[PDB]
From a paper:
Rhodobacter (Rba.) capsulatus has been a favored model for studies of all aspects of bacterial photosynthesis. The photosynthetic gene cluster in Rhodobacter species contains a unique gene, pufX, which encodes the polypeptide PufX present in the light-harvesting 1–reaction center ([name]–RC) core complex. To further investigate structural and functional roles of protein-U and PufX, we have determined the structure of the native Rba. capsulatus [name]–RC complex. Although this is generally true for the structurally more conserved RCs, our work has demonstrated that structural differences in the RC-surrounding [name] complex between these two closely related species are significant and that a broad diversity is possible in the structure of this important component of the photosynthetic apparatus.
Surprisingly, and differing from all wild-type LH1s with known structures (obtained from ~10 species), we have found that the current Rba. capsulatus [name] structure in an RC-associated form contains only 10 αβ-subunits, making it the smallest [name] complex reported by far. PufX is located at one edge of the Rba. capsulatus [name] crescent and interacts with one pair of αβ-polypeptides and the RC-L subunit. PufX in the Rba. capsulatus [name]–RC has a “turn-up” conformation in its N-terminal region (Ser2–Asn12) that self-associates with its own transmembrane domain (Trp21–Tyr28) and interacts with nearby [name] α- and β-polypeptides. In addition to the BChls a assigned to either [name] or RC, an isolated BChl a was identified from our cryo-EM density map in the inner space between [name] and RC on the cytoplasmic side.
Numbering used by the authors:
A (entry chain M): 2 to 305
B (entry chain H): 1 to 248
C (entry chain O), J (entry chain Q), K (entry chain I), N (entry chain S), P (entry chain V), S (entry chain D): 1 to 56
D (entry chain L): 2 to 282
E (entry chain P), H (entry chain N), M (entry chain R), Q (entry chain T), R (entry chain G): 6 to 48
F (entry chain X): 2 to 66
G (entry chain K): 1 to 55
I (entry chain A): 1 to 44
């Protein structure tokens, strides 16, 4: 067996790289350390991390959301440390019942869920501007922010947009480990087998395609690491034999291939289709279609 | 909006699913054209441009401007001609299309097949600050943090014959990664061996890609402390071509 | 009213006319489909009642 | 029709079987011995699916379904009209998958690249064999494998999953889902990051990989690197499929009750099981 | 004001044709709405 | 290869050529036994491995109505 | 309105003809399918009732 | 302007035959609608 | 009929015989497996 | 009140007009749908009652 | 009228004939499919009732 | 740039003449096919 | 300032056309609300 | 109070205006939507009770 | 009409006859399978009824 | 109580102001929403009880 | 002193027009609240 | 003219054989359809 | 039929024979399997009933 | 840590307290009005 | 280039003769097989 | 952490204050709005 | 003359003659195997 | 001194916090 280039044979480290000073206020970066255990598969350097106000706002409101759920668990546990650890996966911060609609429910009957959801909404949005701003100050494109927006689309549909259109917060996702799994299963049951939602099927094709594509692309690059294929940016500007052998493997296998830059357009679009189509399918569930299996039978692709 | 049909059974979910197919059909067209910026137009075995070019058209040119102000345009004739090999030592094994081309001579030295190298720009790869991306360890201040240090280890070739010793390591400064091992052969010349085609044992470095007799013909670097993108392509292609052309 | 021609000095006519055409067609389909939803303005439904077609 | 650089790579050799007998290209496609057997198996499997549609009486592609033999049939080779056609298509599918992987090995050898792609694809073949061969045989019958229909094999997933209550509580299922979600997340970020550097803001030169490391260290405080992300993306996809195959391998063979009841070993530990309050009292 | 590169005279003929085309679109739209008003008014 | 040797057509008896054809065909038959044995090993091995299971493995409800 | 011929100086004729052809075909299919979905204007069902084709 | 590279006279030649085809297409379309209006009017 | 020897001028005998062995062995397996679907000829 | 023209010295006209256009269109669609969702101001159902359309 | 031949000065005959052939075949299959889906115009269903073949 | 395909005006007239012959033959068979179906099972 | 590359004279001329178009948009919108106010007042 | 113009020496005017623009719009929508929620202040369901439109 | 031979000046014969061969076979199989799907025109089913093959 | 001005030599003014803005707006919304929830201090509910508007 | 590349003079112009726009925004808001208070007081 | 490299004479020789094979293929297909029409008509 | 030998001047015999061989074996297997799927033409079950072996 | 000299920070604190005091005054005036309208004590 | 394969007319003529002999033998056996099946178990 | 410890400690003060204030509202005994409603007859 | 495989026409004849001798032996054995099955358990 | 500033400001916050706790007691006490 030859070297499969899954782990580095030798680790070499010098002074930690503090980053590029394009427009970043470099005094807002932490120190940088070196962690050897991470250097076998990737970089050994940990940090420096930029802390501006977007990240600080996101961190404090994310912590507040995390602790708001946590304190509710202590209330559910009777403030008993043993009961808290026994039932940690069974605790749930449920949304208000359906009788309150979109109003502000009492604290004990879903009001905390509304407080926690508000903190989460702030934290996610404060993190999105961090994703946008970090790319802007380095002179890079905003592809990460747009890809993140696709994940936010599904997340906002689940927690905000669909409860608004359904007319009550009760349909929102509970904040718990097993409970939000039970919510997922119950969502499929009371909408008639979410398998027959076409956009759920499209979402799964994208999710399966994402793992197929990353296995294809990850293995393709490792195959051509003999010729510096992992230096994709330099291969885009100056095409080498790594880019050609990678293109010719897939042309001779599938009949068509990508380029170094273009394979990452397949990668980003396959991945954002997971949550773009997923958000649409959840929005249609209940609001437009209440029984996907019956809807299927009407439209073919389900036996009568 | 449940049970509201524009016509027949075509409700809002039907409109969304059909709208998606139109978007997906266009997205595939967009993705396919964006992947036709390299290797086009197609050619025949005789070298002439091909009659068939496929249902998708070649996209409009786009410009990548490098840190040195090069303004690479893809797709473009000049970019394709820059990376085009000339005077290839290949002959057609049959008049029919779709058949392999037989190397006429030594494929390792002529750079054909798995030993093919691309005419990349004859300049070192450069990081953001302008310095050489790949430099020898002696040129920098780095230490072997973990793993097996290969300095001084014998180099055993594929034919189980010792060809030299490792005298230096060439590291990727921005990525903190070892790319090449500089081997000093018995003749005194120094060659670069890509780390991706070596195996560092507890007491030696083994190179199974090529045999002992092929170590003296590994392509050289003009500058002792500078490796060039073109030289990296030649060295990598030469060693990787060994798996097919070393002994048989 | 005598300087509106300078919009093309800001936006590419190729970019505008493609986006505008997609807009006008999507809007036209939206309005036609809204009418088809409402049985009072579904002209196929109205014609069926007026001319005594079957509409099984 | 060749790419502008493809000619210097079209050289003889790299075949495993047949030498130069099949060492040629048909258009873009490389044909080998395994190119020939892939075409045979793929075409036979496709034509037998159409023949199964003809026996089924429907020509709607979304309603076509080839079902395995009944559970009472055991491991016997079934009659072609009684689920034996599914068995033939399963052999054709496996023949097509395995010869496709072996064809990629020949292409890997001709191009002088690593064999990561055929090995990564073998994991996908393994998960398929778990669902149609290994698990149904461990359960004693071909009738537990999934059918060959676009929407009927989703009914198999639903019926198989609800046999053990909510299948979400399968611990290997949780690990497989987490890796599948992580793989899609890392694929989005890898595609976005490379396109961010290759397509910078207007008026900026193309970004270096130093920018890519700087961006994610600024954002997350860590960066796997260009080599690390491709290693990690490959490993995430392979582990996601592997631990998914484990979740099915233990469901109905080692575990038989509801998966939600399994998690009560943590609750029933005899030092906090009797304490009142909480969810489990 | 040269984001596109038109010479301030191509724009005048670019806009002259566009408004001529826009005028034709509005006239048909108004005639269509007048027909629907007579057929069945929505007011 | 080891089992796919070429033959000396100009210097070789008919019996040597006849044996060489059989060796070539036997090697091909051996290659064809690789997927047959692997498939047979999968089916019988998995079935054999299932015969040492907690015995509720062979009475699971059918996933088909 | 005599100057409409200058559209071809802005948009490539080959891309316009293909895009227009795809649009016109999909629009025609959409309208035919709308008529087929409504039994009153489904010309196959109308002929079935007129000629007693059973169906 | 002149993004496509055609001269002004080539545009006139191309538009002259485009409108002839468009005139032919609409002429058939109007006759098609007139036939349908007689056979099964929708107004 | 007597001119079929020219098939070896088209296909290399060294390579064809290996392919024949794969085909002939798998055909014998295919027929034996087909017999099992019928208990009357189910030898085992 | 005549210094408003300085906004273009800090805001890209190409980005403002696109943002304004999407904002103005989405705002109009929201208001039209809101009126459409209220039966009192839904102009299609109001016309149905006034003119006695079937509205099946 | 007699100037349509200039279409070939714009579109590659190889590309047009292939796309036209694919379109014509797929369109023909679509129309044959619609007729087969309609039991009144399904000529196999019509024949088996006229000649009394199987009707099962 | 109105010579995208590189054909001459003479070649286009020759190519179009053959194409219209094929188009006419295709329509003529289609008209005969519809006339036959209209007799067999009219849809109007 | 000058974050966009426009000049003092370029920006002022751009703003004049923007306000003229904005005035037309307001004028139609005001007329539309007057028509709705007459037909179906919301106050 | 005569030295509040120094804010633009600290904050980026481009970011402040965008942040202020979204904040003013989101706040205004939120207040308008709360008013619509309350039947006492829903101006649409005040006219329908005053002039008399649907009452349903 | 008599100039249809010029299609070979536009279409590569090797490309066409591969496409034509795949088309004719897949069409021929499809039509046979459609007939086999319908019991009225399934010639095997017709034979069992005629000869009492059971 | 007059040396507090030194704190601006340490913290960045941009991040302190943005932190002030988010904290103040969040607190203001929180206090208003608590009042809206309580019918005793819901100024709309008080107004409709005082003025007799809809009460629904 | 400029944290964002604005001169002191530029900050004078920017703040002056900003307060001009803010003054108009409050003035319309004050009138709007006055009208609603007269139309339907919330106190 | 000759996108495939064939000459006018070669294309005629190609087409003569292709039409010879096509006519034979159609002739058998007509006989097969006639046989099925006699055995089990579909009209 | 006297000029059919020109086929081999267009298609190389090596690829045609390989394609022809796979097609014939594929077609033969498909037809044999179709008959085996039909119990009335399954020669193994027909032989079982004629002689009497298991009948199961 | 900020990069502002003492003189430049003198007015920075003065303007902030100038704006903070105005904010407090409006809040105080609002609470006085609410006490008159709907007292909570 | 009507000699895509590189064969001459003489080589193609003798290759076609051998191919047509193999086809003829193949068709002859298939006809005999169909005659045997038709007698044993007719499908018409 | 001269400029960083202050932010974190302020959050701890803010989180605790917003927590306990709302808890007192949950308990009707410590709800000041409730007692004001009873006194003035709101 | 054609020799896609580098065998002379003489060498192809010798190899084919040996191959056909083995092919005849292989079929004869297979016929004997079928006669054993036909005697023991006929399939017609 | 940085710490000298913090202690004086922090003590004033605690001073009013104590004064507010006793303000609750005189209005509504719990102990
Ligand atoms: C295309 C769709 C896919 C996708 C894409 C995607 N996700 C993304 C992105 C993209 C492109 C980003 O750029 C963004 C990112 O930053 O990635 C690194 C992100 C992201 N996706 C994430 C998660 C995520 N993505 C998921 C899914 C997906 N993401 C899809 C598969 C999921 C799933 C499957 O559930 C998850 C869980 C994050 C890693 C990140 C966004 C993080 C974020 O918004 O965080 C805000 C901050 C917080 C919530 C704070 C959390 C604090 C902790 C709970 C600890 C608190 C206490 C502790 C003691 C610390 C101290 C606190 C105080 C006392 C100081
Ligand atoms: C204001 C509210 C409207 C909602 C936010 C819309 C977008 C606001 C964008 C503000 C401008 C911006 O993009 O600022 C961002 C922070 O915004 C932030 O926290 C925003 C914090 C609030 C976000 C969540 C708001 C509720 C949802 C980024 O800051 P930094 O990278 O740390 O700075 C580095 C230096 O240059 C100093 O600035
Ligand atoms: C849920 O809670 C409820 C809603 C119930 C109660 C809560 C209410 C709350 C929290 C209310 C909060 C309200 C606040 C904070 C309101 C603040 C409003 C402000 C500050 C508005 C300011 C507006 C300023 C405007 C509109 C300025 C406009 C300026 C212009 C139009 C001029 C253009 C600017 C130019 C040209 C600058 C460029 C110049 C140069 C030289 C570059
Ligand atoms: C759902 O709808 C259904 C399917 C039910 C109904 C729809 C049916 C449809 C749409 C059917 C469409 C049918 C069509 C389009 C059929 C077309 C058939 C054609 C064009 C057949 C042509 C056959 C031509 C043949 C077989 C030619 C053979 C030639 C030879 C045998 C000679 C070989 C010579 C060659 C190949 C080249 C000669 C070379 C030299 C150098 C002379």
């Amino acid at each position: 067996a030859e070297y499969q280039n899954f782990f580095n044979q030798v680790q070499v480290a010098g002074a930690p790289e503090m980053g590029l000073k394009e427009d970043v206020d470099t005094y807002e970066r932490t120190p940088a350390g070196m962690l050897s255990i991470l250097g076998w598969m990737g970089n050994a350097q940990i940090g420096p991390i930029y802390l501006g106000i977007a990240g600080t706002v996101s961190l404090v409101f994310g912590a507040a959301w995390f602790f708001t759920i946590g304190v509710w668990y202590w209330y559910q546990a009777g403030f008993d440390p043993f009961i808290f650890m026994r039932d940690l996966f069974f605790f749930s911060l449920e949304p208000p019942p359906a009788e309150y609609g979109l109003a502000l429910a009492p604290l004990k009957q879903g009001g905390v869920w509304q407080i926690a959801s508000l903190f989460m909404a702030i934290s996610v949005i404060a993190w999105w501007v961090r994703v946008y701003t970090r790319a802007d100050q380095l002179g890079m494109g905003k592809h990460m922010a747009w890809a993140f927006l696709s994940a936010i689309w599904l997340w906002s549909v689940l927690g905000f947009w669909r409860p608004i259109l359904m007319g009550s917060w009760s349909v929102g996702v509970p904040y718990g480990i097993f409970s939000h799994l039970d919510w997922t299963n119950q969502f499929s049951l009371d909408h008639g087998n979410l398998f027959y939602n076409p956009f759920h099927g499209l979402s799964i094709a994208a999710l399966y395609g994402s793992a197929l594509l990353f296995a294809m692309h990850g293995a393709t690059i490792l195959a051509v690491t003999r010729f510096g294929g992992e230096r994709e940016l330099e291969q885009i500007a100056d095409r080498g034999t790594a880019s050609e052998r990678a293109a010719l493997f897939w042309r001779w296998t599938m009949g068509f291939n990508a380029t170094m830059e273009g394979i990452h357009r397949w990668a980003i679009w396959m991945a954002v289709m997971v949550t773009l189509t997923g958000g649409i399918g959840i929005l249609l569930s209940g609001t437009v279609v209440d029984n996907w299996y019956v809807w299927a039978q009407v439209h073919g692709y389900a036996p009568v | 909006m449940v049970g509201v049909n524009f016509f027949g059974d075509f409700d809002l979910a039907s409109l969304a699913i059909w709208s998606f197919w139109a978007f997906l059909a266009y997205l595939i067209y967009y993705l396919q054209t964006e992947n036709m910026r390299e290797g086009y137009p197609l050619e025949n075995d005789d070298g002439l441009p091909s009659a068939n070019q496929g249902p998708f058209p070649v996209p409009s040119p786009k410009t990548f401007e490098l840190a040195d102000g090069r303004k690479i345009v893809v797709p473009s004739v000049e970019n394709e001609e820059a990376h085009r090999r000339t005077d290839l030592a290949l002959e057609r094994t049959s008049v029919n299309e779709g058949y392999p081309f037989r190397p006429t001579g030594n494929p390792m030295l002529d750079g054909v097949g798995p030993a093919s190298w691309v005419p990349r720009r004859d300049e070192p790869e450069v990081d953001a600050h302008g310095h050489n991306k790949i430099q020898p360890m002696r040129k920098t201040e780095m230490t072997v943090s973990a793993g097996r240090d290969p300095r001084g280890m014998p180099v055993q070739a594929g034919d189980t014959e010792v060809v030299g010793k490792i005298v230096d390591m060439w590291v990727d400064i921005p990525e903190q990664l070892v790319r090449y091992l500089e081997v000093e052969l018995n003749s005194g010349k120094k060659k670069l061996l890509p780390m991706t085609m070596l195996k560092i044992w507890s007491d030696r470095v083994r190179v199974n890609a090529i045999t002992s007799d092929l170590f003296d013909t590994i392509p050289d670097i003009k500058s002792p402390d500078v490796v060039t993108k073109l030289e990296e392509d030649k060295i990598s292609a030469y060693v990787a071509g060994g798996y097919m052309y070393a002994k048989g | 009213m005598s300087k509106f021609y300078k919009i093309w000095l800001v936006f590419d006519p190729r970019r505008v006319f493609v986006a505008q055409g997609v807009f006008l067609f999507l809007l036209a389909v939206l309005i036609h489909l809204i009418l088809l939803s409402t049985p009072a303005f579904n002209w196929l439904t109205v014609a069926t009642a007026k001319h005594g077609y079957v509409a099984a | 029709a060749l790419l502008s650089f493809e000619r210097k790579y079209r050289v003889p050799g790299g075949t495993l079987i047949g030498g130069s007998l099949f060492d040629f290209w048909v258009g873009p496609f490389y044909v080998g011995f395994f190119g020939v057997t892939t075409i045979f198996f793929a075409t036979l499997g496709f034509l037998l699916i159409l023949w199964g549609a003809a026996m089924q009486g429907t020509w709607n592609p979304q309603l076509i379904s080839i079902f395995p033999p009944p559970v009472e049939n055991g491991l016997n080779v079934a009659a072609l009209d009684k689920g034996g056609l599914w068995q033939v298509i399963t052999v054709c599918a496996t023949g097509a998958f395995c010869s496709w992987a072996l064809r990629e090995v020949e292409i890997c050898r001709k191009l002088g690249i690593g064999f990561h792609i055929p090995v990564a694809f073998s994991m996908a073949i393994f998960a398929y064999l778990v669902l149609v061969v290994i698990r149904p045989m461990m359960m004693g019958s071909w009738g537990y494998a999934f059918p060959y229909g676009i929407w009927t094999h989703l009914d198999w997933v639903s019926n198989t999953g609800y046999t053990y209550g909510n299948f979400h509580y399968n611990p290997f299922h949780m690990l497989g889902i987490s890796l599948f979600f992580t793989t899609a997340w890392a694929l989005a970020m890898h595609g976005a990051l490379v396109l961010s550097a290759a397509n910078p803001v207007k008026g900026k030169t193309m970004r270096t990989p130093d920018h890519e490391d700087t961006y994610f260290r600024d954002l997350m405080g860590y960066s796997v690197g260009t080599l690390g992300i491709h290693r990690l993306g490959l490993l995430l996809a392979l582990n996601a499929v592997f631990w998914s195959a484990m979740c099915m391998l233990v469901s109905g063979t080692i575990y038989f009750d509801l998966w939600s009841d399994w998690w009560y070993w943590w609750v029933n530990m005899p030092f906090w099981v009797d304490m009142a309050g909480g969810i489990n009292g | 004001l040269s984001f596109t590169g038109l010479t301030d005279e191509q724009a005048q003929e670019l806009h002259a044709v566009y408004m001529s085309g826009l005028s034709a679109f509005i006239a048909v739209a108004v005639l269509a709405h007048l027909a629907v008003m007579i057929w069945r008014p929505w007011f | 290869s080891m089992f796919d040797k070429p033959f000396d057509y100009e210097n070789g008896s008919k019996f040597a050529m006849g044996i060489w054809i059989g060796r070539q065909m036997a090697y091909g038959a051996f290659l064809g036994s690789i997927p047959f044995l692997f498939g047979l090993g999968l089916v019988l091995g998995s079935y054999g491995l299932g015969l040492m299971l907690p015995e509720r493995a062979h009475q699971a409800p059918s996933p088909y109505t």
